[PDB]
Amino acid sequence: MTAAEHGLHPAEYPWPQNGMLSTFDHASLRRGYQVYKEVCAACHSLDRIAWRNLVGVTHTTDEAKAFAEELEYDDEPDDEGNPRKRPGKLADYIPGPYPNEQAARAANQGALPPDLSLIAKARHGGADYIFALLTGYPDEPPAGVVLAPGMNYNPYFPGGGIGMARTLFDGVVEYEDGTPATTSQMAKDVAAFLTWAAEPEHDERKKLGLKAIIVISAMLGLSVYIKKFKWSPIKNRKFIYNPP
């Protein structure tokens, strides 16, 4: 297959979470949530994430309750069996922009924007692919490329023509921590946030792995000593043969 059909392979960026002992940067996760909420969430759902998931990762209990309480969710029917709405709770999932696929495609010239909850695991490249894609729209497609109508050129996307246009531009978001919201900074934060959304156990998993590595290595060393200790009578055995 041609390189174009594969898509250009994203660079390996030095993410904070790269590194056997490294967690996510939670300040970046919080900023990335804000990019999700203000830019991506217009077209993309994050359906696997509940408000409670943000608590103690990016937000306090009160902030997350406030986000939930601003929305309306379907309640159980009232006593005459008529539909009712309630305010959101921490157990509720973050609601998506569209009621069904047909509505989603109608708003995006036929293309269906995927749910982003697993996108960092569902694409080769992970955070690097998301970062490369969001920052990799050239001003002009390479001479000779004919884009289908409603397609945008992006070399990281296989085949080159993606139905999503460039969306991150310097200062589309105003970060609440005073960080300069440049295209690169926003792409880095939202890629970090999406990686967390795909693998929220990441920080705990790598710490438990460090404990396991240490214990298992010590046990491996001791098991070698013990095996050698027990085998030495066999290894050291000597014979004298006197032919009968």
Binding site: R48, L118, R205, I213, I226, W231
Partner: protein, 383 residues
């Protein structure tokens, strides 16, 4: 008389794990048998636990796996342990089978444990294939579709058999629910056959790296091989830890994190890595039925090693030419694996055919010729 010998139940355990007389010179390649037992124990424990949280209905399957990852305490670990140990199971089984082929473990008087072993290997393939479908991601669905359609090649009744397997006209909910029930069962069948091949082996005992009798010099299984097994258990657990905790998705396909969609076809539909050599063999034959037969024959041909090896000596330790041929056979098997996941393009099409011919000619031509000539060289060379 000691209780471990006198009581019939204790004596069965005693005969297999404690007083069992072993050769005194087993090397570390005799440790894969206990690693395979460990993988089987891990897969049973993790698999039964996943079954407590998994839902086999197609509307909920993929989401039940996400619930395991996200909500169940330690669910990420149990899921990653189960998925990675499936790969480790195949690494250990290829090592165990490679040991058996290099050291002549298939020769008399061990034809029966070897022949039951070949069935164990077939059951492991089926077990792993059904388990992979249960996620119900894109690779799950499309892998099930293409592999189950190979049955359509069976003449006359093939199409009918496929619809019967699927329980419908395509891979869907009926297929997923039956694969769950069979995936749960098949490991128990596999454990029984694993036990059978050991009981069959117990009549001759383990072979050894020199290929000679060990009846002259036996060691108890315990404590010697118990403590030697602990070393490879902890080495295995270190490898397990590195994948499960630090790189849990290295051995997987990202497309399996997209929910199954019968409309969109993924760019490349490949089996899991451990099935890749058999897929390359199937591609090599242009005919559909031809390809299926070749692929099955590639496993069943292991049953003829007892016949085609004409050597008067067991095993390769002292056979320089057989060792070279074995080296080429193993590397060819790895190349077939690689070719199983390339695109069907030049020049890999022809290369796959040449590697397929080499694979079969090992059994049918080279091993019978080389083993015949080495017999003559040992005789003449030592006169």
């Amino acid at each position: 008389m000691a209780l471990r010998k006198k009581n019939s139940l204790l004596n069965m355990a005693n005969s297999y794990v404690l007083d069992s007389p072993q050769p005194s010179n087993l090397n570390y390649f005799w440790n894969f048998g206990s690693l395979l037992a460990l993988c089987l124990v891990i897969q049973l424990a993790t698999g039964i636990t996943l079954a407590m949280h998994y839902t086999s209905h197609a509307s909920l399957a993929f989401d039940s796996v996400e619930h395991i990852m996200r909500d169940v305490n330690f669910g990420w670990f149990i899921r990653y342990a189960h998925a990675n140990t499936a790969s480790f199971f195949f690494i250990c089984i290829y090592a165990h089978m490679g040991r058996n082929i290099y050291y002549g473990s298939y020769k008399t008087p061990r034809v029966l444990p070897w022949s039951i072993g070949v069935i164990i290997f077939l059951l492991l393939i089926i077990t792993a294939f059904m388990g992979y479908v249960l996620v119900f991601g894109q690779m799950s669905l499309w892998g099930a579709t293409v592999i189950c359609n190979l049955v359509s090649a069976i003449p006359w009744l093939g199409e009918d058999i496929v619809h019967f397997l699927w329980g419908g006209f395509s891979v869907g909910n009926p297929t997923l629910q039956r694969f769950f029930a069979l995936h749960y069962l098949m490991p128990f069948v596999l454990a029984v056959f694993a036990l059978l091949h050991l009981i069959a082996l117990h009549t001759a005992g383990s072979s050894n790296p020199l290929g000679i009798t060990s009846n002259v010099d036996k060691l108890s299984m315990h404590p010697y091989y118990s403590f030697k097994d602990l070393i490879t258990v902890f080495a295995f657990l270190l490898m397990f830890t590195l994948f499960v905790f630090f790189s849990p998705d290295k051995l997987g396909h990202p497309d399996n994190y997209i929910p199954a969609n019968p409309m969109v076809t993924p760019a490349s539909i490949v089996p899991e890595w451990y099935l890749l050599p058999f897929y390359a063999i199937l591609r090599a034959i242009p005919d559909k039925l031809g390809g299926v037969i070749a692929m099955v024959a590639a496993i069943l041909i292991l049953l003829i090693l007892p016949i085609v090896d004409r050597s008067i000596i067991r095993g390769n330790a002292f056979k320089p030419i057989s060792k070279l041929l074995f080296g080429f056979f193993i590397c060819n098997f790895l190349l077939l694996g690689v070719l199983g996941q390339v695109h069907i393009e030049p020049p890999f099409i022809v290369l796959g055919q040449i590697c397929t011919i080499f694979y079969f000619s090992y059994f049918l031509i080279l091993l019978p010729m080389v083993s015949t000539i080495e017999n003559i060289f040992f005789y003449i060379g030592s006169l």
